[PDB]
Coordinates of C-alpha atoms and ligand atoms in Angstrom, one line a residue:
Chain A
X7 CA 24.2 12.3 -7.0
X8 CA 22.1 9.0 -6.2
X9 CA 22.4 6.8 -2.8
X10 CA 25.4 4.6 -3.4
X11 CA 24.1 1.1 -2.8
X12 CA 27.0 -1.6 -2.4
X13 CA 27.7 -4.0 -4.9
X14 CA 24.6 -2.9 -6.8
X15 CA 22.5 -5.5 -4.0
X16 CA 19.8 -4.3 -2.2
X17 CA 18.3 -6.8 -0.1
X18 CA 14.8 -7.3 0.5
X19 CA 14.1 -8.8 4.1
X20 CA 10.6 -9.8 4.3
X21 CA 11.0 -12.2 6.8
X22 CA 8.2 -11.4 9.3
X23 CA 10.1 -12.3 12.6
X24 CA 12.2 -10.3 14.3
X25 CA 15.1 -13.0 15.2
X26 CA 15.1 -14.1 11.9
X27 CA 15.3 -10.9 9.8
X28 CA 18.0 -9.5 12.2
X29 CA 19.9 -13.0 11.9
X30 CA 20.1 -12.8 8.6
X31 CA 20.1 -9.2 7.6
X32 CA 23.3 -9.5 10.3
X33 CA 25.1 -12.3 8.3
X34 CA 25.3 -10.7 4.8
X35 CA 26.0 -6.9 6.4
X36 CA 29.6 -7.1 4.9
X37 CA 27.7 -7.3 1.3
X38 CA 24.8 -5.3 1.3
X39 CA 24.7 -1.4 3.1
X40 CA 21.1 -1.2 1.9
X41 CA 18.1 -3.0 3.2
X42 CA 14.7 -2.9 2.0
X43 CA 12.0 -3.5 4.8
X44 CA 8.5 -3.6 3.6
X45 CA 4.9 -4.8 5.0
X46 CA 5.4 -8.1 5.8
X47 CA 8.3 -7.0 8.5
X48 CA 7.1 -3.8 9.8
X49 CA 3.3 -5.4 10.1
X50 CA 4.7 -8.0 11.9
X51 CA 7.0 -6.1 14.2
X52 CA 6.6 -2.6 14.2
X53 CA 7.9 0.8 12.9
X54 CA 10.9 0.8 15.4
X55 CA 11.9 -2.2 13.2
X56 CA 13.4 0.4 11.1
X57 CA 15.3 1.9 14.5
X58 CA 16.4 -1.5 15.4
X59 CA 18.2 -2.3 11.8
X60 CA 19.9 0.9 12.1
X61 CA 21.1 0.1 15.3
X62 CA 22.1 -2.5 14.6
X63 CA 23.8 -2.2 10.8
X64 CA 24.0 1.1 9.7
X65 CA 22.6 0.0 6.6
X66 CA 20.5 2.3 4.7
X67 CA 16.7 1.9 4.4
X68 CA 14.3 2.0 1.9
X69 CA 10.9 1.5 2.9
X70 CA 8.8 -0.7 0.8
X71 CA 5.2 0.9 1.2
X72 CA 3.7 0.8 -2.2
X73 CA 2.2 3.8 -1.2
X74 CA -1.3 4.0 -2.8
X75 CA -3.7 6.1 -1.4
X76 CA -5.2 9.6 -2.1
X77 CA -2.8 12.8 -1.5
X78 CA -4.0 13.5 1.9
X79 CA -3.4 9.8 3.4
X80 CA -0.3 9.2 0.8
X81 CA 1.1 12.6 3.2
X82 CA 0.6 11.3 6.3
X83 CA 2.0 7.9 5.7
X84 CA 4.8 9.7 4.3
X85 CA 5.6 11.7 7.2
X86 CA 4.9 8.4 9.9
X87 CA 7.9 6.8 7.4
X88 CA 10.2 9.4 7.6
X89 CA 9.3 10.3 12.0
X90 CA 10.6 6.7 12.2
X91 CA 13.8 6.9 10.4
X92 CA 13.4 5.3 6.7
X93 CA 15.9 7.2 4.3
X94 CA 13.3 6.6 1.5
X95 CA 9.8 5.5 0.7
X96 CA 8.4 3.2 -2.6
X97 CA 5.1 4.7 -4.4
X98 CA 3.0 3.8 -6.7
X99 CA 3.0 6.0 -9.7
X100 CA -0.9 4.1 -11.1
X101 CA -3.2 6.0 -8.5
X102 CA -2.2 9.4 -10.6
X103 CA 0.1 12.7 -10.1
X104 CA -1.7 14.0 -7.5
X105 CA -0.8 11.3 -5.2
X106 CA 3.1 11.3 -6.3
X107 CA 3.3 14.8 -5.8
X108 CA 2.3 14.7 -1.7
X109 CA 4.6 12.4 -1.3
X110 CA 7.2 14.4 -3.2
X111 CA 6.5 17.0 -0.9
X112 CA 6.9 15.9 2.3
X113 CA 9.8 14.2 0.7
X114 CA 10.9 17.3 0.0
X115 CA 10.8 18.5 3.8
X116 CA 11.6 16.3 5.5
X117 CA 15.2 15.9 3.2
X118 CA 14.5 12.5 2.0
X119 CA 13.3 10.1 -0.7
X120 CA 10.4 8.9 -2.8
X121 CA 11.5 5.8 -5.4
X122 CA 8.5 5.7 -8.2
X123 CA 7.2 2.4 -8.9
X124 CA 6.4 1.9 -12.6
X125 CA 5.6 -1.6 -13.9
X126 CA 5.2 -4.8 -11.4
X127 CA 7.4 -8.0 -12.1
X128 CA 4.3 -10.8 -11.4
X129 CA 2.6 -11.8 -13.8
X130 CA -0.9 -10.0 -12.9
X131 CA 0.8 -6.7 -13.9
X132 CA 0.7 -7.3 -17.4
X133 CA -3.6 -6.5 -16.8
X134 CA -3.5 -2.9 -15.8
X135 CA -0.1 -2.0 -14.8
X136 CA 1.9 -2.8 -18.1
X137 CA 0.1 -0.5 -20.5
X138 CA 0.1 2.7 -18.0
X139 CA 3.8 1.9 -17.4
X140 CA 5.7 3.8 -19.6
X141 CA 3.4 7.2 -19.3
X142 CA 3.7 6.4 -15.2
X143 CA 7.1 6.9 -15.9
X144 CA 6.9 9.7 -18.1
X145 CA 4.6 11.5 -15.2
X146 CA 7.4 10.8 -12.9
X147 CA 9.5 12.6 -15.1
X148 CA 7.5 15.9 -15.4
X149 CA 7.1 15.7 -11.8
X150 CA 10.7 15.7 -11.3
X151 CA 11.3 11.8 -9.9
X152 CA 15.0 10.8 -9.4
X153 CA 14.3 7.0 -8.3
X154 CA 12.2 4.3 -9.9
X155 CA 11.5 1.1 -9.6
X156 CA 10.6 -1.4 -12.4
X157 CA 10.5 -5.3 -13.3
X158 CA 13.9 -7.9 -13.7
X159 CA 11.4 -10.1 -14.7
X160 CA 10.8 -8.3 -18.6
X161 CA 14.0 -6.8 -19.6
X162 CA 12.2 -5.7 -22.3
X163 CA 10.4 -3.4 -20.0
X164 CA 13.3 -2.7 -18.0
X165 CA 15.0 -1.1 -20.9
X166 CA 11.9 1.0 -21.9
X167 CA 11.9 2.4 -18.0
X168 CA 15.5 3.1 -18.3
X169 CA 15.4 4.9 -22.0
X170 CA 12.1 7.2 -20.5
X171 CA 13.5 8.0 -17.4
X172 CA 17.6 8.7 -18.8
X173 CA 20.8 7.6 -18.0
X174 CA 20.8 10.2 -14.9
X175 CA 17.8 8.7 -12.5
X176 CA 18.1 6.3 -10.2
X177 CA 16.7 2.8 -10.8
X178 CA 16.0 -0.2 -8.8
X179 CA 14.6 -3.9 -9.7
X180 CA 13.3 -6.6 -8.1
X181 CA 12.0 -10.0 -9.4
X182 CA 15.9 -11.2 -9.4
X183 CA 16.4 -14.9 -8.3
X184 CA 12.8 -16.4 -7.1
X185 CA 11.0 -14.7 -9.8
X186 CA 13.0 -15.5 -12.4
X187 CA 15.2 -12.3 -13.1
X188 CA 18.8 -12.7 -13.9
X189 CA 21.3 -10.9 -12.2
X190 CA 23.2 -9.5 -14.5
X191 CA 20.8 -9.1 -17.0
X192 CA 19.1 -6.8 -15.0
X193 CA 22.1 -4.5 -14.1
X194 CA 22.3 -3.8 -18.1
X195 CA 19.7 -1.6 -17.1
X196 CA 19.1 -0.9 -12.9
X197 CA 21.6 0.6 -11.2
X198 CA 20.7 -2.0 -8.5
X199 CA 19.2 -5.3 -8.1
X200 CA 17.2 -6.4 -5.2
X201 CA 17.2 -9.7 -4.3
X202 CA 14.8 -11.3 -1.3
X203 CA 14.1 -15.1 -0.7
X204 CA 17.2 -16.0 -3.1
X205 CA 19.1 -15.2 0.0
X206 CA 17.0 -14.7 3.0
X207 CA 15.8 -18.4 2.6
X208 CA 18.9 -19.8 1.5
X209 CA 20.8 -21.7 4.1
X210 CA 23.5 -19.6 4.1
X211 CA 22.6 -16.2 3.1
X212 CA 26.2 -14.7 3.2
X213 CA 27.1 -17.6 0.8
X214 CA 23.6 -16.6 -1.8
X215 CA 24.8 -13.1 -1.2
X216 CA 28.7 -13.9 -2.0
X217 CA 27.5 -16.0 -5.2
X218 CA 25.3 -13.1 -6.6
X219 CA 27.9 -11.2 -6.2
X220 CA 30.7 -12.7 -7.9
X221 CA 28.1 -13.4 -10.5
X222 CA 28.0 -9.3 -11.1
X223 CA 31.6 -8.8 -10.2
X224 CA 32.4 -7.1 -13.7
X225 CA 29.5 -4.6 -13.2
X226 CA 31.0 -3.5 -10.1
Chain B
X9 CA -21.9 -7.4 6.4
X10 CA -24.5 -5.1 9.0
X11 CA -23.2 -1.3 9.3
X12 CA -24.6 0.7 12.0
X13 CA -26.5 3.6 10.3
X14 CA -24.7 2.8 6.9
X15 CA -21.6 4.9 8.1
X16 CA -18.1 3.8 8.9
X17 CA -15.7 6.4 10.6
X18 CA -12.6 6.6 9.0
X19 CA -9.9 6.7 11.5
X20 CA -7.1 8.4 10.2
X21 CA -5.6 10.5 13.5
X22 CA -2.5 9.3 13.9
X23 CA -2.5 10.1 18.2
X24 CA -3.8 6.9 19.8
X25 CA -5.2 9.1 22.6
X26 CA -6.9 11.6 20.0
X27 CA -8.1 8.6 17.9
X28 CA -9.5 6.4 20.7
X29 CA -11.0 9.5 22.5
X30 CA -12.7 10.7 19.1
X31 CA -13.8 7.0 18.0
X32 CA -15.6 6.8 22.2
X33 CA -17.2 10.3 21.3
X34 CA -19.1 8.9 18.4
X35 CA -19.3 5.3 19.7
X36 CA -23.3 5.2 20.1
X37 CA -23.6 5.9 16.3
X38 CA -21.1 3.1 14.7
X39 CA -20.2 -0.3 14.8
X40 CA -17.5 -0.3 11.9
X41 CA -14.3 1.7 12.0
X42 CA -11.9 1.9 9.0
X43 CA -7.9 1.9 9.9
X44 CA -5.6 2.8 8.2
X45 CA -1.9 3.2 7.9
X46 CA -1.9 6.6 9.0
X47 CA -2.9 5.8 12.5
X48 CA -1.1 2.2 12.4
X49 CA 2.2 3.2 11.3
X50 CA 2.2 6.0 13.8
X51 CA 0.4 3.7 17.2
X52 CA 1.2 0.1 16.1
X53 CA -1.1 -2.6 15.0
X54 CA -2.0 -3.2 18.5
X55 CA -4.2 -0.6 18.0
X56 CA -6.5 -2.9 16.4
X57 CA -6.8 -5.2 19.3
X58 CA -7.2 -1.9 21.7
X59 CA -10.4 -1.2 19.6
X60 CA -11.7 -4.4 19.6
X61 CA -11.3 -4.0 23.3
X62 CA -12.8 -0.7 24.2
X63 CA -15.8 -0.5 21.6
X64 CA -16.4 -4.0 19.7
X65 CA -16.4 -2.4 16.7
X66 CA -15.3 -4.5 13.3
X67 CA -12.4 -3.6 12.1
X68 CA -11.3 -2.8 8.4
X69 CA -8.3 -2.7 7.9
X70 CA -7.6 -0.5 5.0
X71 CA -4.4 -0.9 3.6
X72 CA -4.6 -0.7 0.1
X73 CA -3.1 -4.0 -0.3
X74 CA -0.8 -3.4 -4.1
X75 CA 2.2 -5.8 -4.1
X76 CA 3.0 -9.1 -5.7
X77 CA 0.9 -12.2 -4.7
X78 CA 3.6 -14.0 -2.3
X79 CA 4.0 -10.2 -0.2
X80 CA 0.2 -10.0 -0.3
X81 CA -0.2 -13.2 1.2
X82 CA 2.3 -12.2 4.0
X83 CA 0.9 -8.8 4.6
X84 CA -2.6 -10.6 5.4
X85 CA -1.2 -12.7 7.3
X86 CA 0.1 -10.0 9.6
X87 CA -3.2 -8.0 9.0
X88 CA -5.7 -10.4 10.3
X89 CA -3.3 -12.0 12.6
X90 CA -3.4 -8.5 14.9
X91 CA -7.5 -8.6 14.1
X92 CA -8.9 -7.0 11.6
X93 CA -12.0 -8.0 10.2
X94 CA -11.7 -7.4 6.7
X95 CA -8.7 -5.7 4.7
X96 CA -9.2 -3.3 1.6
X97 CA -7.3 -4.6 -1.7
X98 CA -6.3 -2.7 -5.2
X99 CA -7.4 -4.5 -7.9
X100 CA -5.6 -2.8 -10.7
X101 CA -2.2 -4.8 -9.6
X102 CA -3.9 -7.8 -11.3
X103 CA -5.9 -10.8 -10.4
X104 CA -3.2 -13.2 -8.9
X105 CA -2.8 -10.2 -6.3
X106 CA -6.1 -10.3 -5.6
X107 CA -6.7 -14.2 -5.4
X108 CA -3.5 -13.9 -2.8
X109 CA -5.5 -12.1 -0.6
X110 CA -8.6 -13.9 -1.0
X111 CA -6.9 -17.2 0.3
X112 CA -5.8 -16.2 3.2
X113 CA -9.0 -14.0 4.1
X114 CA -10.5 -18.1 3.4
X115 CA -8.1 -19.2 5.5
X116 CA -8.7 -16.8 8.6
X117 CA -12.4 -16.5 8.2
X118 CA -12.4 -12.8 6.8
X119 CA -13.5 -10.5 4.0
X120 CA -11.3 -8.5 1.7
X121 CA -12.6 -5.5 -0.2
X122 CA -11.5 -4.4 -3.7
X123 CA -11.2 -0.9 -4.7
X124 CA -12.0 -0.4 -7.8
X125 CA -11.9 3.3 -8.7
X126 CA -10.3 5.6 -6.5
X127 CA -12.2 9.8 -5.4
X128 CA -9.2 11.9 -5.7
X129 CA -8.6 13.7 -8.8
X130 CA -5.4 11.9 -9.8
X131 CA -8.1 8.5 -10.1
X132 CA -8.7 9.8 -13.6
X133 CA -5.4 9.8 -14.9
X134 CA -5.3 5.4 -15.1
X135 CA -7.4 4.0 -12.4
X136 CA -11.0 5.4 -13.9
X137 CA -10.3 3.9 -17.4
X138 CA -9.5 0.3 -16.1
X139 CA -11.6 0.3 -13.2
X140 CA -15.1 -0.9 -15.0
X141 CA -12.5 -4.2 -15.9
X142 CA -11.1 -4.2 -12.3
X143 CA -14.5 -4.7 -11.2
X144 CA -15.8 -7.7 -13.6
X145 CA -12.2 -9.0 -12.3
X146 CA -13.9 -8.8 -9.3
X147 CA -17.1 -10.9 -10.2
X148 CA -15.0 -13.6 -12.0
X149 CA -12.9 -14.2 -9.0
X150 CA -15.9 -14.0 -6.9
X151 CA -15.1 -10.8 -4.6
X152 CA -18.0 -9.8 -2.6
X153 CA -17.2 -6.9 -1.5
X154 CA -16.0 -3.5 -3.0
X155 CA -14.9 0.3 -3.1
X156 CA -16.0 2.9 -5.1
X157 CA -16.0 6.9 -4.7
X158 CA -18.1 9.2 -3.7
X159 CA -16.9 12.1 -5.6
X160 CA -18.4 10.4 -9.0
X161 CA -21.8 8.9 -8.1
X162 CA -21.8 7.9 -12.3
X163 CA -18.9 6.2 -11.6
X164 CA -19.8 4.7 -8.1
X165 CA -24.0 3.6 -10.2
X166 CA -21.7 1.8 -12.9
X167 CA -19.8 -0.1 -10.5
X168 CA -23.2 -1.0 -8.7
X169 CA -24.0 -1.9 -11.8
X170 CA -21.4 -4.1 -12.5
X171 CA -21.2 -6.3 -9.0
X172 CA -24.7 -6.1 -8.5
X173 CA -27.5 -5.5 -5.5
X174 CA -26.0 -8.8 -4.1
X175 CA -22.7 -7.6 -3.5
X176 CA -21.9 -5.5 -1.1
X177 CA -20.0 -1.9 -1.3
X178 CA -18.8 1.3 0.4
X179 CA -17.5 4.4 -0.6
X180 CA -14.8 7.3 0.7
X181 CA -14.9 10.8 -0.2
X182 CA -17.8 11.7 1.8
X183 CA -18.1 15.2 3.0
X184 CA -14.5 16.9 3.2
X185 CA -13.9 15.7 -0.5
X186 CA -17.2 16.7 -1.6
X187 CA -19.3 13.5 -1.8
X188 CA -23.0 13.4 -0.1
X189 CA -23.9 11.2 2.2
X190 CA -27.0 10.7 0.6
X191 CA -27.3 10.5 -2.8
X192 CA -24.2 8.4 -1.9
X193 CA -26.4 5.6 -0.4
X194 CA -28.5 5.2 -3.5
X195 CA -25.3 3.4 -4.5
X196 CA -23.1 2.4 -2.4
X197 CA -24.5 0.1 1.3
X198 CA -22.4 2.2 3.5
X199 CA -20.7 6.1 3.5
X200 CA -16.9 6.2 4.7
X201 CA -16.0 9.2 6.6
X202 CA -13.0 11.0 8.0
X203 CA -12.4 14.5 8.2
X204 CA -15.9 15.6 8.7
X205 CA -16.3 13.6 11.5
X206 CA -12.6 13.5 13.6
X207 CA -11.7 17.4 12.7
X208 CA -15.0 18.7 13.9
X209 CA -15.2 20.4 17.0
X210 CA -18.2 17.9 17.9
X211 CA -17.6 14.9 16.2
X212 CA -20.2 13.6 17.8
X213 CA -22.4 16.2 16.8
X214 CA -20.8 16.2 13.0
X215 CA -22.3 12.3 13.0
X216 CA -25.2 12.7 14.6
X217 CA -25.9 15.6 11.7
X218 CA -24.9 13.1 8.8
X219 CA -27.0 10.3 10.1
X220 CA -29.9 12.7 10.4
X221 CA -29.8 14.1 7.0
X222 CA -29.9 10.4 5.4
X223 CA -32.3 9.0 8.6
X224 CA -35.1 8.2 5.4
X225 CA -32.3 5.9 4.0
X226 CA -32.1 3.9 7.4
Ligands
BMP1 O1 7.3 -5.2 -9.0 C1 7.7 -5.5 -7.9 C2 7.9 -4.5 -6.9 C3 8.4 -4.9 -5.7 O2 8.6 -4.0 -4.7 N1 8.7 -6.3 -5.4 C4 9.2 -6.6 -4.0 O3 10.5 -7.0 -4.2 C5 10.8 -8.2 -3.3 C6 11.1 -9.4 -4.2 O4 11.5 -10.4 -3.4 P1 12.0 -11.8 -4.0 O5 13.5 -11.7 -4.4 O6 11.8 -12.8 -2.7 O7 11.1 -12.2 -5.1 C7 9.5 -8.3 -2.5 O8 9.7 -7.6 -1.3 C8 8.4 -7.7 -3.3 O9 7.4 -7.2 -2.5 C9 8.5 -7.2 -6.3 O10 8.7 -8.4 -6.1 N2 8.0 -6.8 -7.6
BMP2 O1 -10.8 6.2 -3.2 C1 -10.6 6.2 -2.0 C2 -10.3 5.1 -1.2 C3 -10.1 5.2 0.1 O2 -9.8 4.2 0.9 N1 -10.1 6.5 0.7 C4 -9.9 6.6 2.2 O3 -11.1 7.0 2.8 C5 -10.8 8.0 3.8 C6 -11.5 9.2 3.4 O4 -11.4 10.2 4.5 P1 -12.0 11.6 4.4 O5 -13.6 11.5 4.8 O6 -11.2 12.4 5.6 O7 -11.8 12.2 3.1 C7 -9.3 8.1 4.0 O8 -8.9 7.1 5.0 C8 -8.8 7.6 2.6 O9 -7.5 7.0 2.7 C9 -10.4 7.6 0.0 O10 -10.4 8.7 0.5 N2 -10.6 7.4 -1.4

């Protein structure tokens, strides 16, 4: 019972202009039903961004928020997500249970969902992040998470992540491609992989997309 | 940075007629308003530009910047691009995060904030025990500018402690989370406040009250 994410590829689309993130987004629809929009989009062009890619793909959207505030904002922001049409929203687990669990519950109401960010994949997340990581997860667990998100970049990590959380939760990892994560290294251990600039700057995106793909085609 | 009676209003409705109405009712009594993602995912970031238009106010934009340094860069981009002044940064994602935003602040003549330790309860579970580090993070990298809570003025006279008199700092959880406005200025240069202002039935009345009861501090 998890979202069923073609050929295990989400794609990030940070591109920050409209043309150009609907071009492209457009041109590898026939490989990826799954679209991650974050910041650098919907700063750039709006909520109704989120509207417009449904329109346009019926692809379904996570939205990349990071949320990261105290309960009360980490609510509203949740609720402003949802109102605009986002199937599910990224949080960060680091700012405590108390700010999970709001966005669990509007979650909750508004029949949608929260992924749990654990570890990062850059390298400054080895200074805070890394040794909160696995008890993040842990807390995730208690609180009753389904979908996480953690780093392509350390597969040792990856694997720690996936062990805490169990075979039955959802998880998702970025830091494939430009980054440095491997494709199908990572999908010993996601259930997805999302991949961003590796395709969206590529000169043919369908063909980066395609490539990945075949790349994975035994996982599939 | 010069703060109008050491108090920014946090502007967290998320109606643009409610929030530009309630910001004009207090107008006389601050030049800084905090937005957030409340009232920008829900109006648009236009509605920093229709601020800037209507009252002159600065702008921070607080957005609790927490991803990887090339999204960071990209998210100030599109932060100061629609006018904000300033933009408020986590620290505990790491210092390459936080040098990300501090180029392109550089690079657009603005000022990011780091938050170092967070007011709500859930702060204690990992923030509170790396935050003293986040902050000497800050120092190293040269950040100028910081956040620190209310809630725990031990916590928020440590982190004073740390950036020092020079540096400049503010502080959230004033009032509806249980913070005072003025033993919160022995710490911090300016209070942040939401909820005690914008649900009152007189916010103009609710700030006048708060600026009154620190008016020695002023
Ligand atoms: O730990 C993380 C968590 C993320 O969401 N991301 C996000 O995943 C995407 C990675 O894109 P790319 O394939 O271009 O490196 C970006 O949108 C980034 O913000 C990440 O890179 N690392
Ligand atoms: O540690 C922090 C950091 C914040 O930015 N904030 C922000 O400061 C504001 C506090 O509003 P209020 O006075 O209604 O509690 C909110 O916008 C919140 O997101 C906080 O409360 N605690």
């Amino acid at each position: 019972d998890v979202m069923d994410v073609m050929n295990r590829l989400i794609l990030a689309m940070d591109l920050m202009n409209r043309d150009d993130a609907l071009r492209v987004t457009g041109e590898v629809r026939e490989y990826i039903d799954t679209v991650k929009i974050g910041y650098p989009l919907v700063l750039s062009e709006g909520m109704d961004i989120i509207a417009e890619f449904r329109k346009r793909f019926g692809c379904r959207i996570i939205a990349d928020f990071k949320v990261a505030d105290i309960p009360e904002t980490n609510e509203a922001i949740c609720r402003a997500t949802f109102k605009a049409g986002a199937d599910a929203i990224i949080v960060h687990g680091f700012p405590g249970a108390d700010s999970v669990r709001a966005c669990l519950n509007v979650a909750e109401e508004m029949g949608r969902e929260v992924f749990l960010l654990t570890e990062m994949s850059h390298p400054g997340a080895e200074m805070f992040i890394q040794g909160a990581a696995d008890e993040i997860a842990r807390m995730g667990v208690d609180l009753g998470v389904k979908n996480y998100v953690g780093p392509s970049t350390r597969p040792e990590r990856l694997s720690r992540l996936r062990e805490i959380i169990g075979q039955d939760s959802f998880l998702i990892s970025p830091g494939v491609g430009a980054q440095g994560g491997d494709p199908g290294e990572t999908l010993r251990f996601a259930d997805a992989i999302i991949v961003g600039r590796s395709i969206y700057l590529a000169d043919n995106p369908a063909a980066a997309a395609a490539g990945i793909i075949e790349s994975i085609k035994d996982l599939l």
